[PDB]
Amino acid sequence: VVGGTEAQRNSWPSQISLQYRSGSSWAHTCGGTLIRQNWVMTAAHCVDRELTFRVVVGEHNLNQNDGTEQYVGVQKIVVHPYWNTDDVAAGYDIALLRLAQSVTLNSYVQLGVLPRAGTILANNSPCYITGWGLTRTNGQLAQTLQQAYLPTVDYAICSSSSYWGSTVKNSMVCAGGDGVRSGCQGDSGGPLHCLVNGQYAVHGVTSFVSRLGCNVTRKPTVFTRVSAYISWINNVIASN
Ligand SMILES: O=[Se](=O)([O-])[O-]
Ligand SMILES: [Ca+2]
């Protein structure tokens, strides 16, 4: 995330790091949200490649031992049936990862709370994006988990000509756009946490930013709207 600040140690316990094997090492590629002890919600584009993936929960610093990490393999990947890698603007950028083993919940590993189906945030709702993604457009991943305050931009405004126009759909949530702060590559698949009735809930799965760059004025970060997918999520967990 660009223009963020380091998150307090595990203040976002449902945030996970999705990593793939590179030779004999592991590289972080995307974020995700732990939604069941053995299920992770991420972006479908994060798993377009047929790589070996692992999920790390309780993570904070990617390249240093935090003493709280749990590592687990991904046993099954269920991508939304309508996802089309050639058309991220069509939406459906969401996938569920069934973990090889259930992780242990504790102070650093907790389930993310999802909104009620159909919920839409009022314009300018307070939200935070979190992740280890690039700290600058075409930059490098962050070592420690970052967070940025990104107020929502409602559909009417977000789909206007000066913003994203027709590229954005109602199945998405836009947030930020101030030209300073934003999600970026590597935050993809991670959460957009927003305060709802005293509870932070994960309303978005990071999907895309402008081809011109991450922090671009009037090009808010775009997320898959989690509340449009509650039934699908429940159905996947129920049939696996
Ligand atoms: O009402 Se909704 O979340 O677009 O199905
Ligand atoms: Ca670590």
Give a structural overview.
The PDB classes it as hydrolase. With 240 residues, this protein is mostly beta strands. The chain has two domains: 1-12 and 112-227, Beta Barrel (Thrombin, subunit H); 13-111 and 228-240, Trypsin-like serine proteases (Thrombin, subunit H), CATH 2.40.10.10. It is 5% helix and 34% strand. The chain is built from two helices and 14 strands; from the N terminus they run ββββββββββαββββα. It has helices spanning 155-158, 230-238; strands at 5-6, 15-22, 25-36, 39-42, 53-57, 70-79, 95-99, 127-131, 146-149, 152-153, 172-175, 191-196, 199-208, 221-225. The strands form two sheets. An eight-stranded antiparallel sheet has the order 1-9-8-12-13-14-11-10. A six-stranded antiparallel beta barrel has the order 2-3-4-7-6-5. Bound molecules: selenate ion (SE4) and calcium ion (CA). Calcium ion binds at residues 59-62, 64-66, 69.
Which oligomeric state applies? monomer
Overall number of structural domains: 2
Tally of alpha and pi helices: 2
- Could you say what the CATH architecture of the largest domain is? Beta Barrel
Largest sheet: 8 strands, antiparallel
Distance between the termini: 33 Å
Going across the major beta sheet, what is the strand order? 1-9-8-12-13-14-11-10
Q: Helix proportion of residues, in percent?
A: under 10%
Structural class: mainly beta
The CATH homologous superfamily of the largest domain:
Trypsin-like serine proteases
Please provide the count of β strands. 14
Radius of gyration: 16 Å
PDB class: hydrolase
Keywords: hydrolase, serine protease, crystallization, substitution, metal-binding, SE, SAD, calcium, zymogen, protease, selenate
Assembly: monomeric
Entry title: SAD Structure solution porcine pancreatic elastase from a Selenate derivative
